[PDB]
């Protein structure tokens, strides 16, 4: 992984992210939602677990985006958790949780769940 | 379980449910959200997995409530998944998923996640 992870990844819904996998487990880069404009670019940061692998396993990783930049503050953050599988059709398969800041009466409906697959293509 | 499960259960948020655990895995009863009025009572249905247990494990179970009755149609359903642990302080610890009917553009934010503990008290 590491070298395989670094680059640009696209999902099914139009989003892009660019990430560098740094040598001791660090992931850093930016997530852009849409349009093609500075206003949809947000910072990401995460970690991946580098492993000596003999059997074709995925590499486990996770990153967080807080949805605040200089043009938008959506009072929320998303985490994605999943694994990188390299090769011909490398993908990162993830499940994600999006939490919004709520009042304590609304806390029980603060968190959405879903899933994304990202490909290099 | 079976005999232990049948009865009334309360969660942290004010909700009540009454369930019968029938001999071959069936759960049936009603969920009432609040107030103390026919209008907050909804049908539940689920299953539990009966097991010969030698080591103090929970019993796995799950049920579904669709949020439509004669006074309300909220265009959604919740499933709870977890386990019953009997004894002095019997509880059912669960995680739940609530999906609302959406248009296909909004499908990605159709599903909330959270958790509830129910007790007999």
């Amino acid at each position: 992984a590491e070298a395989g992870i670094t680059g640009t990844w696209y999902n099914q819904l139009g989003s892009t992210f660019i990430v560098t996998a740094g040598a001791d487990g660090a992931l850093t880069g930016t997530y852009e939602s849409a349009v093609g404009n500075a206003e949809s670019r947000y910072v990401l940061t995460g970690r991946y677990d580098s492993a000596p692998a003999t059997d074709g396993s995925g590499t486990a990783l996770g990153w967080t985006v807080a949805w605040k930049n200089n043009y938008r503050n959506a009072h929320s953050a998303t985490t994605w958790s999943g694994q990188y599988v390299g090769g011909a059709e490398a993908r990162i398969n993830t499940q994600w949780l999006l939490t919004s800041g709520t009042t304590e009466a609304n806390a029980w409906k603060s968190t959405l769940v879903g899933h994304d697959t990202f490909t290099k293509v | 379980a079976e005999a232990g499960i049948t009865g009334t259960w309360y969660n942290q948020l004010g909700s009540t449910f009454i369930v019968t655990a029938g001999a071959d895995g069936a759960l049936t009863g009603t969920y009432e959200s609040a107030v103390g009025n026919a209008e907050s009572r909804y049908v539940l249905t689920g299953r539990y997995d009966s097991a010969p247990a030698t080591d103090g494990s929970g019993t796995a179970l799950g049920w579904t409530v669709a949020w439509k009755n004669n006074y309300r149609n909220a265009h959604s359903a919740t499933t709870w998944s977890g386990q019953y642990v009997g004894g002095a302080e019997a509880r059912i610890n669960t995680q739940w998923l609530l999906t609302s009917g959406t248009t296909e553009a909004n499908a990605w934010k159709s599903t909330l996640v959270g958790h509830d503990t129910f007790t007999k008290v």
Binding site: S33, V35, W67, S76 | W108
Partner: peptide
């Protein structure tokens, strides 16, 4: 038009 969705 939450920043995680399409567009926005």
């Amino acid at each position: 038009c939450h920043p995680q969705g399409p567009p926005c």
